[PDB]
Every structure is written in structure tokens, then in C-alpha cells.
Amino acid sequence: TXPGVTXPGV
Amino acid sequence: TXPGVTXPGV
DNA sequence: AGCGCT
DNA sequence: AGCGCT
């Protein structure tokens, strides 16, 4: 996720 | 990806 | 440090 | 079987 905690997605 | 080869994303 | 399958 | 970081 994020970043942080990519996306989703990308 | 896909599925197959989710998304991205989800 | 944390998303989702056919 | 295959996406992407700050």
C-alpha cells in the first residue's frame, strides 16, 4: 500500500 | 496481474 | 511495512 | 505466474 502501508495498485 | 499474468491492482 | 487470484 | 516503493 501507499507507499507506505504502490496503491494498491502500482 | 489479471488474474492471471489482481489488476494491478486488487 | 503492506493489496489481490484464477 | 505475475505489479509497485518510500
Type of residue at A4: G
Contact status, residue B6 vs residue A8, Cβ threshold 8 Å: no
Cα–Cα distance, A5 to B5 (Å, whole number): 24
Residues forming a β-bridge with B7:
B2
**A10 min Cα distance to partner chain B (Å):** 6
According to the entry, how was the structure determined?
Answer: NMR
Residues forming a β-bridge with B2:
B7
- Provide, as residue numbers in chain B, all residues whose Cβ is less than 8 Å from the Cβ of A7: 8-9
Cα–Cα distance, A4 to B7 (Å, whole number): 19
**B6 min Cα distance to partner chain A (Å):** 9
Type of residue at B6: T
Q: Is A9 left (phi over 0), alpha (psi -120 to 50) or beta?
A: beta
Residues forming a β-bridge with A7:
A2
Where do runs of H (alpha helix) occur along chain B? Answer: none
Q: What is the 3-state secondary structure (H, E, C) of B1-10?
A: CECCCCECCC
Contact status, residue A8 vs residue B9, Cβ threshold 8 Å: yes
